[PDB]
Amino acid sequence: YRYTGKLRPHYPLMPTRPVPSYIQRPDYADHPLGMSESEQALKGTSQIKLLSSEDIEGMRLVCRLAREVLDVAAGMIKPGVTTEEIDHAVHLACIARNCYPSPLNYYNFPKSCCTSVNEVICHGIPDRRPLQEGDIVNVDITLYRNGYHGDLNETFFVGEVDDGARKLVQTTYECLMQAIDAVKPGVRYRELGNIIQKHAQANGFSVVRSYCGHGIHKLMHTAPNVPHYAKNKAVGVMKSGHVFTIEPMICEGGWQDETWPDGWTAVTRDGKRSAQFEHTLLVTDTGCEILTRRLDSARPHFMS
Ligand SMILES: [Co+2]
Ligand SMILES: [Co+2]
Ligand SMILES: [K+]
C-alpha cells in the first residue's frame, strides 16, 4: 500500500473494549461480521420513515446524549493525546449514559468512535498516534439507546494550526449551517449538495463524493441518501417527521478518496486535509430541529 500523506496507522490496537451486558445492543453488535439484519432488510429502498411522537422522543434523547459524549471528547483534544485515549473516554461516556457506542463492531469496525486526522476524510480508527500540534481532528460519535441511534461530528484544532486549517474548518462548518438553513418540508434532498458545493468551491475547496449524509433512527444508515456535492441524483423530498444527517466532508486539494488496507480509513488520494461537521436533523412544519445541537454554547468547539 502506498500511503497518500504523512499519516500512518499506529498498531497494535488495545484489545476490543467490553460493553457491559446491561446496555442494550443493536442487532449487529453480536453478528460475527458486524452485519445488521434490519438495515439490510431495507437496503436499496427509497422510502423514508415518518417518525411517531414516540420516535421523536427517542431521537431527541439519544441525540442529546451523543452531543454530551462529543463534548467529552472535545475537552481532550490537545497535543500528545492519542486517538485511542479519546476513544477510551468516549466508550466510557457512552456506557455511563446507558448507551451502546454504535460504531463498535458495525461491520466489524473495532472502536467506539471514528477519529479522522488531517488527510483522513472519515472513518479513521482510533490508534496509538499522539495528536500533533498543527493537526486537525474530527471525532464522530454515534450512540444507541432504546432502539434509536443519534449521530454528530465536529473537527477540532490541536493547539495552534495554520491559516489554511482555519479556513478549511470554518468553511466546512459554514457549508453545514447553510445546508441546514435550507431544510424544511418540500425541499428536495438533492438540493443540499448545490448549496454545499457552491460555498466550498467559492473558497477553493472541493467536496467528497463517495460518502453522504443519511437517514437515521432505528437503523444507523438508511434512506435518504444525502450527497454533499452539486447536481447530484439524490432521491426524495423533505417532509415533517423525516430525520436525517447532513455531514459534509470538504478538502483542500481534490475530492477523490481511497481506503486504507484496514478497510475503513478514507483518505484524500492527494494527501491534503479534509474537514467535516455533522448534525442529525428532524424536519418540522416550519423548518428543522437540530437534535444534536450544542446546549451550553451557540457555537462549535473550534470557535472558542
Ligand atoms: Co457520524
Ligand atoms: Co452520519
Ligand atoms: K480530517
Curated annotation (Swiss-Prot):
Superkingdom of origin: Eukaryota
GO BP annotation list: platelet aggregation; protein maturation; proteolysis; regulation of translation
Cell location: Cytoplasm
Enzyme Commission (EC) number: 3.4.11.18
Residues engaged in binding Zn(2+) 3: D140, D151, E278
Cofactor(s) the record lists: Zn(2+); Co(2+); Mn(2+); Fe(2+)
Record field: catalytic activity: Release of N-terminal amino acids, preferentially methionine, from peptides and arylamides
Residue numbers binding a protein: H123, H221
Keywords, comma-separated and alphabetical: Acetylation, Aminopeptidase, Cytoplasm, Hydrolase, Metal-binding, Protease, Zinc, Zinc-finger
Chief localization: cytoplasm
Cofactor binding: number and manner: Binds 2 divalent metal cations per subunit. Has a high-affinity and a low affinity metal-binding site. The true nature of the physiological cofactor is under debate. The enzyme is active with zinc, cobalt, manganese or divalent iron ions. Has high activity with zinc; zinc cofactor is transferred into the active site region by the ZNG1 zinc chaperone.
Molecular function per GO: aminopeptidase activity; initiator methionyl aminopeptidase activity; metalloaminopeptidase activity; metalloexopeptidase activity; zinc ion binding
GO cellular component: cytoplasm; cytosol; cytosolic ribosome
Binding residue positions for Zn(2+) 4: D151, H214, E247, E278
Protein family (similarity comment): Belongs to the peptidase M24A family. Methionine aminopeptidase type 1 subfamily.
Functional description taken from the UniProt entry: Cotranslationally removes the N-terminal methionine from nascent proteins. The N-terminal methionine is often cleaved when the second residue in the primary sequence is small and uncharged (Met-Ala-, Cys, Gly, Pro, Ser, Thr, or Val). Required for normal progression through the cell cycle.
Description of how the protein assembles with itself and partners: Associates with the 60S ribosomal subunit of the 80S translational complex.
Name used for this protein in its record: Methionine aminopeptidase 1
The organism of origin for this protein: Homo sapiens (Human)
Lineage: Eukaryota, Metazoa, Chordata, Craniata, Vertebrata
Section covered of the full-length record: 81 to 384 of 386
